Every structure is written in structure tokens, then in C-alpha cells.
Nucleic acid binder design. Structure first.
Ligand SMILES: Nc1ncnc2c1ncn2[C@@H]1O[C@H](COP(=O)(O)OP(=O)(O)OP(O)(O)=S)[C@@H](O)[C@H]1O
Ligand SMILES: Nc1ncnc2c1ncn2[C@@H]1O[C@H](COP(=O)(O)OP(=O)(O)OP(O)(O)=S)[C@@H](O)[C@H]1O
Ligand SMILES: NCCc1ccc(S(=O)(=O)F)cc1
Ligand SMILES: NCCc1ccc(S(=O)(=O)F)cc1
Ligand SMILES: [Mg+2]
Ligand SMILES: [Mg+2]
Lengths: 432, 432
DNA sequence: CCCCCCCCCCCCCCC
DNA sequence: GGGGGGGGGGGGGGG
């Protein structure tokens, strides 16, 4: 999977007339710029292009669309275009359009216009879909990334980048999505319903079997026919019994595979998190952090067995383990959230090396700024040859840039600036 | 007027055995240290000492109290001591104590022990109060600053420092708290009750007067009749006068309140406007302002209470838009600090007390430099008046350099973790 | 009449 | 809005 080029028109501080573009490097796309230049907007456009999700608190009132009053028109059309290649060689472009009207009554109304996923063959166009509902499905499907991963891990909004350190209910929600826990309980539950239904049939069938057996002893129509219906019903009974077991064994197999998958996944995730923490965190006070999962089970013959995962991020010091929630510093929260997202990206999409880190050194001190950068350099070096990585870093931290030593990977970087009209523009610069 | 010495024992990463102290300088207290040193804890304990409020997300599970498991004991008692001077010369110390038990049921529970406000006559201690409910009221009076200002503005938790940029209701609640509208609106309602009651008496009185007028006219004992007519008429006029006095008093009260609200918002926006133009490096935002929208019609909760809506606007050229859902991370951080500086300056203009915890979060190099230079200008201007007590926590080295603390400081404080991973506060010297 | 202590209420907080 | 814990308040009792 790979993302090639992004096009932005009329989104936030990007003007409505002339599209601005950025092309993504491998293994690293570096984006710098002043406060309010428009860097975070770039990642907003990647998330919108891939999922149709708009930034939180910007979904209505057209905060996402370049404000009509600034340009002097009563209507502004926004457009985002993303070109990418699927896991197989294939080449796609997704376009999305959104409109913002200022009516004569000053009322603003936002409307989502038609978009399109189109396939390019040898450089020539074919329409795959023009329905926004399918685009979400199709793009992630082509990219090789679940939507829950695009949303929470890869294109995580800067305002939301600390979700791993949030309250338990919220944390659970995001892991439940990432693990699709609602989907598999619905699987288990449907099988259970079917099993109960086949169970009701079996009671009726055994009755009938007892009845047809007796008619055969009395006949013993006629005894030759009397044996026929007895046999027909006997087979339905035995056949139903077998069906009941198969549904039951299958139900158990599904539950077991699901429970082991979850364990394996969590074991991998905690390993990476432990490695990332021990390498990068300079403090002595926390040796490692871990995601601990507490399963709540409720078992009844009517509701069968339903598992509920509760999740916690704990920090480990010596013998002691404590829940980090409500107990970690601003800087610790920032580092833990980045590492956990890296760990999830590595476990859940082991092969698409895609993640956006928007201003990773927030609240980090000088030592941690250095080590984080060197760890990022270390991740890149290890995976550069494999061709796996498309990593996007946004920063204006000069200390961070210096220690990353990105020139080893980059021939260029992108700078987002405001022009004289105060429009966001994206200029490509030489690594020099 | 001033805060002198703080003592911390068994709170978070501070060990339960030996208390750490910090002494506050004028005009500036500088506090540095690595991620997780315990710098934010210091500000929490200041809040806790003055208002009794604990850090958000820490009122349960005793997250604020140094964890019993770390020591090898099952119970920890925390203590925080703050010595300060009232608006008058008087010298006080408030002490608060907290306990966190690992119960017979295994999970932790926290309990609030005895507290004390103690007055110092040099060489003699006197308990002014040992009422944990009363400490809040007494302390805030002595400091000369309202409880909601200590909470939102002076000692605002780092996790909460962006509240000005929060959702409308959340912003409104805090401005509401800051604007104590309940006490006086209830005064108005009680006057209104009386005014209405005199109104009914007036209706009955006017009737009786018409009756007495006719009897006087019939007599034209005539002297008796004129007496009764006058008597009744003077009662009518007297009641009218009483109605007018109550009515005018009601209006004077209500008017005084609207004037106060207007006056403050005006000063607040003046200060915010100067700071923005003075501090913000960037062409895209000329100024920011706080707009107050009154709900056309006051809702009735045991009185008629006006409902204000508040919004933070950014101004560029002719155009104005709401910052909510539209500003960058750095812009949120800068706007929130400036709004707090302005809130301190207008609402407790007399005592220059504020804590800035990691003020350069997500700020670019230029905005880091200019913010530092603006603080320098604020300090230089008011140093002579002796009012100012500014507390800055930072590990931003470029920021420290532009701050030029040597002009104002003879020493600064460093927070460290000792070999046992306990937070320690070390005092260090500066050249000038 | 002051207050002190306990248990319980209710209140703020967090969900 | 509700639920739970804990602080505080409330009421009864004693100093
Ligand atoms: N609807 C809108 N119309 C016009 N301008 C907008 C709109 N919404 C947001 N903006 C502005 O566009 C900019 C968006 O920039 P961001 O991508 O958040 O900046 P940034 O580069 O991430 O800066 P940071 O986060 O401080 S490092 C902000 O400066 C907003 O003030
Ligand atoms: N109940 C607790 N028991 C023991 N340690 C705790 C407890 N609560 C918090 N801590 C630790 O104490 C530290 C809190 O110190 P802070 O003041 O938040 O850090 P800081 O100096 O502000 O660092 P920043 O915000 O990253 S610059 C963290 O490292 C926590 O791991
Ligand atoms: N997207 C990169 C995911 C990743 C890949 C590798 C590592 S490492 O711990 O083994 F160095 C960490 C994170
Ligand atoms: N606590 C007061 C903060 C403050 C805020 C603003 C100023 S001004 O001189 O630049 F208008 C001065 C002081
Ligand atoms: Mg940003
Ligand atoms: Mg902190």
C-alpha cells in the first residue's frame, strides 16, 4: 500500500481558487511551518480523503470549509483529492467535494457533493464508484487498512492524539472498534439463536418419533409403510441432533479463536510498547508501560457466554504497577500515546508502513526530544530497505529535526506557509 | 497579597517521610525539571492549599496521594502547608491533611483528615479555624482573590489550561462561576415580591379612596368626611412612593450588575487585544476578542437570571470568526494564556499572582521568543510596584534564554527524582 | 450554647 | 442523568 499525492482546495486556510499539492516520500515525509500555517489541515485532508470523517467539532457549521467571508463570495467549494496505489499494483484517485453556502439571511449551510473513486489504467480513467457510502469502504479496502485503524492510529487528529490516556470507557470504545468486538459477539449470538431454534424442533421431532414408533408396533397404513414413516422421522431426529452439536462445536471454535487472537495481539502490542518505552523514555521513574486487559464474563443459558473487555494503561516501576490514568505527567502522556499508536500500527497493519505524527515533541524535555528523534531514525533505518515505510512527521521543533538526522532519507521536505493573501501554500524545499 | 513558602509531603511522587519546600520570589519564581519531575504537582498543591480542590481525574482512587504500594506500608498520610500574607500585613499558614488507605477490601480509599488555618503573630501561633469547609472561605478572603479565580485562572491545572477554547457551555459555566450572578439576582426577586404586595395594597387603597371621595362629596359631619378622604388619599400617595422606591432600588441593583459585567469584559478585551498584537507572531490573526451574547430573555430559577453566551473570536481585516473548531494547537495555547493573564489583571487587579505551567506548548520558535519577551515587559513594568508574583514552569531552553531571568532572579528552583525516585526540590543560584 | 462525632445524606464529580 | 464515593452537613447528643 502507498499514498502518492494529495491535493487540497478551499479547506480551512487553503484558498478556494488554486489547489495546493503535496507528494509523499519514502520513507519519510517531513512537514514544517509556523503556528497556524496549515500543517494539521494536511492530515485532516488525508483522513477525510480516506474515510470521509471530518475533524471533530468541525463536522457542521462549515469550520472545515474556507470561510466565504474571507474570499468575498457567498459560496465556497472545497475539494480534496488523494492519489494512491493499492496493495497490488493498482492506481487510484479518490475525490471528495463539500460545499458551503451563505444564504441571503446570513444562514450558512454545508452540503456534501458528489465524490468519486476512479481507477487509472496505464494513465487512463475508469469510474469505480460515485456513492459516498462505498468510498469509505472501497478506499480502506484498497489501501489495506481497517477504517478503525485509519481513524484512531494512522491519521489520528492532533486534538485526539492522547486518546490512549483517556478515561476507561473511552479507551474501551476505541479498542472495541479496533478489535471489532461487536461484530464477533453478533456472530456468536446468531449461532446461539439458531442452535436454540434447532433445539425446539428436536423436542417436537422426538415426540413424533415416539408416536410413529408406536404405530409401527400396532401395525406390526401397514407394517411395511409404518416402518417407512418411523424411519423418516428417526433420521430427522438424528440429523437434527448432529446439527445441534455442529452448531455448538462451531460456536465454541469461534469463541476460542477470538479469545486467542486477542491474547496474541495484546502480547505483541505490549512487547513493542515495552521496547519503545525502554529505548526512548529518559526518565528513571518508569521502567515500562503496558496495556492490561481485564475480561468480564457473564454466563447464562439464555445469554450464553458474553465477554466484555475492559482496558487499562499501567506503568511499571520495580515491583509496583500502577494505572497511569490520573497519574502521569503531560510529557509522559504524550510519549505513551505516540508509542501505543506505533505499537498498534505495527501489530494491526504489520505491512503498511503508514502513520502521521503531528507535532510529536509536545511537552517533551530536551532529553526526550532527542531520544524520540533517534528512535524514529532507528525505526526508519530498520525498515527503509524493506520499502515498507511511508511516515509523515509534522514539526516546528528545531532541536528535534537536528537529532533526527533526516537528510539520510530525504532529498526534500515540505514547508507550509501563509501567502500575502494569508492563503496556505505548500512549497517543496531542498534538504539543504 | 503574597505567598511565601510551600511544603509538600506524600503527594504523588513526593515521598511520605520527608517534606519538600519551595519559597516564592518577587517578581518571578522559576521552576525547571525533566518530564515527570513533579513540577505540576507543585502547582496542584498550591491550588489544593488555597481552595481544597484536587486535580481533575484525581478525586478518586487517591491518585493524588503518594501510593501506599511504593513504600511497603498499607497507609499514607499526605500534608500540604502554605504560608502567605494577607492584603494587610498579617501572616498566615493553612495546613491540610489527606489519607489514602489500602482497605480490608483490597482496593484503595482516600479520606480527608483534619485541617487548620493558623495565624502568626511572630513567635505565637493561633488557630483561626480548623474547619475544612471554612478554610476555603477564610483563605480566599485573606489572599484577596475569589475562589473561582484561584481555580480557573491563578492555579489552573495544566490538563485544563485550554478551557477558554472549550465548548460554549463549558466556557459559559466558568465565566458564570467567575461572575457570581446568583447572590444579587435573589436580592432582586425578594424586592420584587414586596413591590407586588404593595401593588395589591394599592389597588385596594385606590378603591377605598374613591369610596371616601364620594362620601366627602355627599357631605358637601362634612369635616369628618374630609378628614377620612385625606387620610385615605395620603395613604394612597405614600404607597405609590413606596412602590417607586422599591422599584428604583431593584433597577439600581440590576443596573449595577449589568454595568459590572460590561466594565469587566471591556477591560478584559482591552488587555487581550494589546497582548495579542504584542505577542503573536503571525499575519493571519490581527486580534482575538471575547464576545458576550445575552439570551434575549432571562430564565426564571427562583429569580430572573440572565443567561450570557460567550465565544472567543478571531479578527482578520473585516472578517470575524469563532475560534472554536478553527484554530491551531499553538493558537489555542497562546490564546488561553493571554485570556488568563487578562482575567487575572481585571478580576484581582491588586495581587499579581499567576502560574504558567509549560507556556510554550506547541509554540513555534518565533512565538516562543515573543511570549518570553512579552513576559519580560510585563515583569519590568510592574517590578517596582512589587505586586507581581509570577510562577513559570518550563523545560524549554530557547524560552529560558529569551526570558532573561537574571534581570529579576537571584535564584531558581529545580525539581528532580532522587535515587529512590522521590521528587525533590533543589534551590539553585543565578549570577544576577 | 457550643461543638463534636458519626452516620448518613446529599453533592459534586465523573460518567 | 445516574451512580458512587466521599466530604460535609445535619442532627442529635455532650460538654
Ligand atoms: N473555516 C476556516 N476558514 C478559514 N480559515 C480557517 C478555517 N478554519 C481554520 N482556519 C485557520 O486555518 C488554520 C489551520 O491551521 P492548522 O493546520 O491547524 O495549523 P498548524 O500548522 O497545525 O499550526 P499549529 O497546530 O499551531 S503547529 C488556522 O490558523 C485557522 O485559524
Ligand atoms: N499517586 C501517585 N503515586 C506515585 N507517583 C505518582 C502518583 N501520581 C503521580 N505520580 C507520578 O508523579 C509524576 C507527576 O509529576 P508532574 O508534576 O505531573 O510532572 P511534570 O514535572 O509536570 O512533568 P511534565 O508535565 O511532563 S513537564 C509522574 O511522573 C507520575 O508518574
Ligand atoms: N510503523 C512502524 C511500526 C514499528 C515497527 C518497528 C518497531 S521496533 O520496535 O522493532 F524498532 C516499532 C514500530
Ligand atoms: N497579572 C497581570 C498580567 C498583565 C497583563 C497585561 C499587562 S499590559 O501592560 O501589557 F497591558 C500587564 C500585566
Ligand atoms: Mg496543529
Ligand atoms: Mg506538568
Amino acid at each position: 500500500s502507498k499514498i502518492e499525492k494529495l491535493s487540497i482546495l478551499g479547506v480551512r486556510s487553503f484558498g478556494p481558487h488554486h489547489p495546493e499539492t503535496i507528494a509523499f516520500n519514502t520513507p519519510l515525509t517531513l512537514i514544517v511551518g509556523y503556528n497556524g500555517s496549515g500543517k494539521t489541515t494536511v492530515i485532516e485532508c488525508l483522513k477525510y480523503a480516506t474515510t470521509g470523517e471530518l475533524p471533530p467539532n468541525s463536522t457542521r457549521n462549515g469550520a472545515f470549509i474556507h470561510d466565504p467571508d474571507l474570499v468575498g463570495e457567498k459560496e465556497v467549494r472545497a475539494q480534496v483529492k488523494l492519489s494512491f496505489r493499492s496493495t497490488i499494483g493498482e492506481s487510484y484517485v479518490v475525490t471528495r467535494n463539500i460545499q458551503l453556502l451563505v444564504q441571503r439571511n446570513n444562514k450558512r449551510t454545508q452540503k456534501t457533493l458528489e465524490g468519486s473513486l476512479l481507477l487509472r489504467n496505464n494513465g487512463e480513467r475508469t469510474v469505480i464508484s460515485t456513492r459516498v457510502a462505498e468510498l469509505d469502504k472501497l478506499v480502506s479496502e484498497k489501501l489495506g487498512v481497517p477504517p478503525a485503524i485509519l481513524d484512531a492510529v494512522i491519521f489520528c487528529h492532533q486534538d485526539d492524539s492522547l486518546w490512549p490516556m483517556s478515561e476507561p470507557a473511552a479507551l474501551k470504545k476505541r479498542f472495541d472498534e479496533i478489535f471489532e468486538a461487536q461484530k464477533y459477539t453478533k456472530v456468536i449470538e446468531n449461532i446461539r439463536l439458531l442452535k436454540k431454534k434447532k433445539g425446539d424442533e428436536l423436542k417436537i421431532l422426538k415426540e413424533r418419533e415416539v408416536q410413529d414408533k408406536a404405530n409401527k408396533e400396532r401395525a406390526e397404513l401397514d407394517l411395511k409403510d409404518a416402518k417407512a414413516k418411523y424411519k423418516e422421522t428417526h433420521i430427522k431426529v438424528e440429523t437434527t441432533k448432529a446439527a445441534i452439536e455442529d452448531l455448538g462445536r462451531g460456536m465454541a471454535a469461534v469463541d476460542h479463536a477470538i479469545m486467542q487472537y486477542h491474547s496474541k495481539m495484546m502480547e505483541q502490542i505490549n512487547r513493542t510498547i515495552a521496547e519503545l518505552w525502554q529505548s526512548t523514555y529518559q526518565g528513571t521513574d518508569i521502567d515500562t508501560i503496558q496495556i492490561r486487559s481485564d475480561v468480564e464474563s457473564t454466563t447464562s443459558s439464555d445469554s450464553g457466554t458474553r465477554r466484555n473487555y475492559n482496558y487499562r494503561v499501567s506503568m511499571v516501576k520495580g515491583d509496583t504497577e500502577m494505572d497511569m490514568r490520573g497519574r502521569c505527567s503531560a510529557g509522559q502522556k504524550v510519549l505513551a500515546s505516540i508509542i501505543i499508536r506505533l505499537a498498534l500500527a505495527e501489530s494491526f497493519c504489520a505491512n503498511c508502513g503508514l502513520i502521521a505524527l503531528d507535532q510529536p515533541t509536545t511537552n517533551l524535555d530536551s532529553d526526550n526530544i532527542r531520544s524520540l528523534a533517534e528512535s524514529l531514525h532507528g525505526i526508519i533505518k530498520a525498515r527503509q530497505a524493506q520499502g515498507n515505510l511511508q511516515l509523515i512527521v509534522i514539526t516546528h521543533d528545531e532541536e528535534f529535526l537536528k537529532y533526527m538526522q533526516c537528510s539520510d532519507f530525504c532529498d526534500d521536505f515540505y514547508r507550509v506557509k501563509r501567502d500575502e493573501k494569508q492563503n496556505s501554500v505548500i512549497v517543496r524545499e531542498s534538504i539543504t
